UniProtKB/Swiss-Prot annotation, chains A, B:
Any Pfam family: CDC48_2
Modified-residue entries (N6,N6,N6-trimethyllysine), positions: 304
Descriptive protein name: Transitional endoplasmic reticulum ATPase
Effect of residue 129 to D: Severely reduced binding to DERL1
Annotated PROSITE patterns: AAA
Outcome after substituting residue 243 to F: In IBMPFD1; uncertain significance
Cross-link annotation Glycyl lysine isopeptide (Lys-Gly) (interchain with G-Cter in SUMO2), location: 7
Record organism: Homo sapiens (Human)
Modified residues (Phosphothreonine): 425
Length: 745, 745
């Protein structure tokens, strides 16, 4: 499975973090069956591993009230392992822990601010007297006594790293106090849990980076060599640098970070020296990871570069990439937001040959990002991260971070009156009053401008079959065409028939062709790419055929994908229709589409769908085998289908049950689904106007309309008119006709 | 609220500057309830803070004639705090002011010009004998005695900064006299009060620059990180450098100024060293502000740059921007008049991610600029800064400064006869006679050429509903469509209807579609962007579709905004109308408009309005949902509406009450609003010609017409003719028609 590597295992060592009844900063409690399963004795020293490279040592004890799958755990060592209640930690035996020869500790600034007494005698000596506490370098532990409990950081141990505080162990705390800034920076370091909406990408990165270095013998045994170059790409602000930081803080391998402007800001001969030194340092500390952030800064296209030194730097990078012998256990990672700007030589074999797309997050992904970014943010109960996530189409993670910052700024604006710039300090009542409400998020949404609105949307559509009324035979035919090869390929192989991978929807406008394409993409849970008429017209007017290939390339990277071409006749009408131009049924954009379809015919998991309201003026070459060779007529709905359409459109609108949708459908004989949606929208508009006017009337008098009613629908049927005439219907009929026989008995 | 930070608070310490009855240069007087509220004793030394970083010390005394909210204040210490009568200052206790050990003072040049006696004995000793005056470094104080009072500047104090002049304090005044040029430069330093028309921008700058450095704990508590990079952009002469100077003179943080030509004029390796030294200096003196004026000079687009050293400088700037850790408390500000010319990498996250638009001022803003620039200018009573401000469309602050300079030059030209170049001095009668009159401003206006006339105008229209006659149902429909979603969004959410965000006005020409768009923009107080037919035609002829997106980008930065597309049929007529060309209802510019409308559909506070006189030849794709899907017919006015139109057009023209506008309206059956305006304009022209000829006749005889009359309107009705024929009206009628039913009982 694609994300099977992200699965952490149901193992006896894995334990759920639980609160501690009576536990000091040196012990943890487990259930007796858990010690029996783990062969752990009471009083044994045990090593605990948690999130973000964190390790600690404790004393394992028995607790009859402790669950088998849980470990009792006080707050101090929870802070040490950077874990919260309900998190999962790993417990192992920690043998051969020797008595400490000498330990150097340092207090935290605010815990010692105002403390002038002897730290040793007041705090450390009673805390470490006849206790034999196990400690680790970098541990943070809180000590009682004095007027005020003081937190200390174990900055040095001998023997290292783990030592027992014996009575003869020399403890000293003389040195520069550990500042709170360092502790906060260490606490807020980025791990994998700080990335949202990139579950596929995280799994792929672990498979291609962490796994080969973690277990090289795994790939050696099966006789394959792991890729050497992984290139992260995506639009700016998608989290490539954040993923780099997470990998750096989460990896056991040696990590070296290289920035583009880092290298390019140095003098000629120092950039090359730094690059070579980085590669040599990685090779010396194998297994190692080299991350080159902003690769396009150092390696643009060599021919399109004018600097001599720049070309020399690109050549040096190519040579260093080729210098790895696949036993150096060095994996080079790179991030760029302009993958095309990279020199193509770097994308060859033995180089950055693997590519991971950190794309634009969907609604679930951006909800995850919002939850991550607001986890340490003071919020109110009215804040619905659901609603913000649904309303932030086109936002990337950086845009969502800016949105949260602007919401907080609006929250501060709401308290501006109690806050003065000239004031040396801010009252604590204002401080604890400060919270980010839903109104602040709404204002930030109103003021936010997304950076990825012009990017092509590649996602699974929300439209399902309940969103479509009628068309049951069309639904069954689409399901067969798209899913039978997927679900029963052996049946197609047995009869020797290659399935058709292209369908054209044709019919009157507003009958559900776009809905059908979206729904068939949704049922298969495949990505959906929609190319509308204005985009084809943009390529036609600008004479920019070459962009068509780009579209198909996206469909390849997004497979399984449904490539949908809506309004294939847009260029045909733009030329004037059937008799508009002297030329006949051949244009540049559709020609490139034909070539790209022929190229895509070998990609099994990309299904191409076309839609047109004017099948007569469509280029016939698109209906040839290997192209949209299946044809489905989407007709005007009949009365039952019209009832279904009216019911589907009114699901989200409160409608009184006295309204009879069957009569509405039977009276709208020649109406399309779009016309019925227009009727429903106008009825809702009338109801909203009535409710607003009634609320205004009451708001005046002090100084109704809960549902749409039958009079609303009648007043909507004033303006309702059928968009498709009988002429058009008949034209589709002779198109369908122009698409008895028995064997002798 | 957006400008809530600019609100300075109603606080007891805040005091209105008032004149002093009997106060020396060392005391201030307050009301007894004010001391009781502030817990201030009589004789206490008090610190006073004013505009432009100014501080001073005085002795607080009681005055029964002093108002509670006012402080009595002599002229000398008003000059010290750089404040005038009616200004607001802050008063606080100033404890632990020690006796001065040694003070060094220096006189002002003209106050000591011609003074050869001992300054100490004549002036300072009687002024500081048994007085115990509190003084500050940099104080300016005037001393009596001699033949002539002398101003002195306290250039050194010990102890510093505040000291008491004790009897044993050693006062000396031996040194280079403080020149008047230095004092004048210090006096005329730019503060926030020197910027006009940038109230939003000043509030935003204080929120994003002054606030994070002022109170970092405010952002730390709410768990957000303040932006690191703020980029000021706008057309040249809008005051970005002036805002930089104001921030430098108004900020408590350390300020470092970097200029583009500053850095780029140095040799290779010295520019980079200066940039790194600036960043290190800012980090050492945190909190600090780095301002990089003319950022485009040092950081153009790297690919579009050919210099090796230039690319290295851009990379170094990127590295320095990334080097900040958000605890360095360093905020980097930059100003550029070519924001697109900036390398895009500098506009990413962790870099110049916030942008403030110092745009073209409106009439109120340029009135503020004129008042600021002429505050120290000798003006006459006929000068109406109102009238200059209304007449300077397209002017930026620099243009207004040049206008004032040219007006002063014309004033000097008017006195040229009494002024000779060869003269060694100019008579004082000419000096005090020199004043800038309204005629000088009129001449400067005639000779002024604005630098921002070709920029897109983004402002709230002056047109209101009184400016429009009739169209009451259209006014109500527009108000509903535009304001009901804004005022009552919960009603739309309850019924599940997404409001239409696009309307198309159609009808005969000259009936008020542009007026309706402007008025609906004005009622909501939203920005208005008008795209006329010639602009669309310019994009069509030049095949420059890509500029359309620019327009929509403006609408995003100006939200809440009304985007108005006037004469959508201009390209359609240019192609020849309905049958002009073989192609049908599809062109490049309207195609880009469709794509941009689809992109803008997610921006709630941008409303798009289209207008056309030929709805038949409009591309139908623009009427689809998500586009201008609402349609409003603006018909020819009826008789009552024509009376209203004639009344509205004649509001600003003196009309005799014998004129009957009802008869004019009833006789002009098929006239449009433009035709009625033509009639009114021709009548005014006839009246003006009559009045001019009568004035000429009297001016001849020596060596009438106060209002428009009925004969004027009759002679105008000579040439008045209806622009719209019945053919066109009927065409609109079958367009409207082509846009009984009851539920069963
Ligand atoms: C069995 C088969 C399956 C196939 O592909 C299956 C498939 N997977 N995803 C998709 S679509 C994607 C998923 C949902 C939306 C997008 N498909 C697919 C392909 C074509 C039509 N429908 C479905 C191709 C070709 C064949 C075969 C049949 C016969 C022969 S032989 C030797 O001439 O006898 C050779 C090859
Ligand atoms: C309530 C709502 C308001 C809105 O926007 C309000 C708005 N603010 N400024 C403007 S315009 C600007 C101000 C004056 C001139 C320019 N508008 C606005 C937008 C559209 C039409 N009229 C006004 C958008 C969309 C909605 C909504 C309705 C229903 C649903 S749901 C879940 O399907 O039920 C979802 C969303
Ligand atoms: N998927 C995500 N989950 C959580 N936070 C994210 C995500 N994507 C971006 N962010 C946040 O938004 C910002 C994006 O900055 P980051 O450096 O990670 O982006 P980038 O794509 O590497 O940048 P660029 O391509 O412009 O160099 C960071 O503050 C990061 O924490
Ligand atoms: N069968 C249907 N069930 C539900 N809604 C429908 C149906 N047919 C049409 N509609 C509605 O009509 C509108 C447009 O439908 P859609 O985009 O799928 O049509 P189309 O055939 O591609 O034609 P067009 O060129 O008008 O877009 C939407 O509001 C959609 O909900
Ligand atoms: N809003 C304003 N209020 C007051 N004075 C202004 C304003 N805008 C400009 N000025 C004045 O006009 C001149 C504009 O020069 P300034 O250096 O401030 O402009 P700029 O926009 O930074 O310049 P450029 O973009 O060409 O570098 C100055 O003399 C300034 O005092
Ligand atoms: N109802 C009206 N009330 C007042 N003035 C009106 C009215 N209708 C038209 N006018 C006048 O007609 C002139 C042009 O009007 P406007 O620009 O709004 O019309 P339009 O419908 O957009 O047509 P056009 O293509 O002629 O500009 C202006 O002088 C305007 O004052
Ligand atoms: Mg990055
Ligand atoms: Mg559609
Ligand atoms: Mg400047
Ligand atoms: Mg007009």
């Amino acid at each position: 499975l694609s994300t099977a590597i992200l699965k952490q295992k149901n193992r006896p060592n894995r334990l759920i973090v639980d609160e501690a009844i009576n536990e000091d900063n040196s012990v943890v409690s487990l259930s007796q069956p858990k010690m029996d399963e783990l062969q752990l004795f009471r009083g044994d020293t045990v090593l605990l591993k948690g999130k973000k490279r964190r390790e600690a040592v404790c004393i394992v004890l028995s607790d009859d009230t402790c669950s088998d799958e849980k470990i009792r755990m006080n707050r101090v060592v929870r802070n040490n392992l950077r874990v919260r209640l309900g998190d999962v930690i790993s417990i192992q035996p920690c043998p051969d822990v020797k008595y400490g020869k000498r330990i150097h500790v340092l207090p935290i600034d605010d815990t010692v601010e105002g403390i002038t007494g002897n730290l040793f005698e007041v705090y450390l000596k009673p805390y470490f007297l006849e206790a034999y506490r196990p400690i680790r370098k970098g541990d943070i532990f809180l000590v009682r006594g004095g007027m005020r409990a003081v937190e200390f950081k174990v900055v040095e141990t001998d023997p290292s790293p783990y030592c027992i505080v014996a009575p003869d162990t020399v403890i000293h705390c003389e040195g520069e106090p550990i500042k709170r800034e360092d502790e906060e920076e260490s606490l807020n370091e980025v791990g994998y849990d700080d990335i949202g909406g990139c579950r596929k990408q995280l799994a792929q990165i672990k498979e291609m980076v962490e796994l080969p270095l973690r277990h090289p013998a795994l790939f050696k045994e099966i006789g394959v060599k792991p890729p050497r170059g992984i290139l992260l790409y995506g639009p700016p602000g998608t989290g490539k640098t954040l993923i780099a930081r997470a990998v750096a803080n989460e990896t056991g391998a040696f990590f070296f970070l290289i920035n583009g402007p880092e290298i390019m800001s140095k003098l000629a001969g120092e950039s090359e020296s730094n690059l070579r030194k980085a590669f040599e340092e990685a090779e010396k500390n194998a297994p190692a990871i080299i991350f080159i952030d902003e690769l396009d800064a150092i390696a643009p296209k060599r021919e399109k570069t004018h600097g001599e030194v720049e070309r020399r730097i690109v050549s040096q990078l190519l040579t260093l990439m080729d210098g790895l012998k696949q036993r150096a256990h060095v994996i080079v990672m790179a991030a760029t937001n302009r993958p095309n700007s990279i020199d193509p030589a770097l994308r060859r074999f033995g180089r950055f040959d693997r590519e991971v797309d950190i794309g634009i997050p969907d609604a679930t992904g951006r909800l995850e990002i919002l939850q991550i970014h607001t986890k340490n943010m003071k919020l109110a109960d009215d804040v619905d991260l659901e609603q913000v996530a649904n309303e932030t189409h086109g936002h990337v993670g950086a845009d969502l971070a800016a949105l949260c910052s602007e919401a907080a700024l609006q929250a501060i604006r709401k308290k501006m009156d109690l806050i003065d710039l000239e004031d040396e300090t801010i009252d604590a009542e204002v401080m604890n009053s400060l919270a980010v409400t839903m109104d602040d998020f709404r204002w930030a949404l109103s003021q936010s401008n997304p950076s990825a609105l012009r990017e092509t949307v590649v996602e699974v559509p929300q439209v399902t079959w309940e969103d479509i009324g009628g068309l049951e035979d069309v639904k069954r035919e689409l399901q067969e065409l798209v899913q039978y090869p997927v679900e029963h390929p052996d049946k197609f192989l047995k009869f020797g028939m290659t399935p058709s991978k292209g369908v054209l929807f044709y019919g009157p406008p507003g009958c559900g062709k776009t809905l059908l394409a979206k729904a068939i993409a949704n049922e298969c849970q495949a990505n959906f790419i929609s190319i509308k008429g204005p985009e084809l017209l943009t390529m036609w007017f600008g004479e920019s055929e070459a962009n068509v290939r780009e579209i198909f390339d996206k469909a390849r990277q997004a497979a399984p994908c449904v490539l949908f071409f809506d309004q294939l006749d847009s260029i045909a009408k733009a030329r004037g229709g059937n008799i508009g131009d002297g030329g006949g049924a051949a244009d540049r954009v559709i020609n490139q589409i034909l070539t790209e379809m022929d190229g895509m015919s070998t990609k099994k998991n990309v299904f191409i769908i076309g839609a047109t309201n004017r099948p007569d003026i469509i280029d016939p070459a698109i209906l040839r085998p290997g192209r949209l060779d299946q044809l489905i007529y989407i007709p005007l709905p009949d009365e039952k289908s019209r009832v279904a359409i009216l019911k589907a459109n009114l699901r989200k609108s409160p409608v009184a049950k006295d309204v009879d949708l069957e009569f509405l459908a039977k009276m709208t004989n020649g109406f399309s689904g779009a016309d019925l949606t227009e009727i429903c929208q106008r009825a809702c508009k009338l109801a909203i106007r009535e409710s607003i006017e009634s609320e205004i009337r009451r708001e005046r008098e002090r100084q109704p309309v809960p549902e749409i009613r039958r009079d609303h629908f009648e007043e909507a049927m004033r303006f309702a008119r059928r968009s498709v005439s009988d002429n058009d219907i008949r034209k589709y009929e002779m198109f369908a006709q122009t698409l008895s026989f028995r064997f002798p008995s």
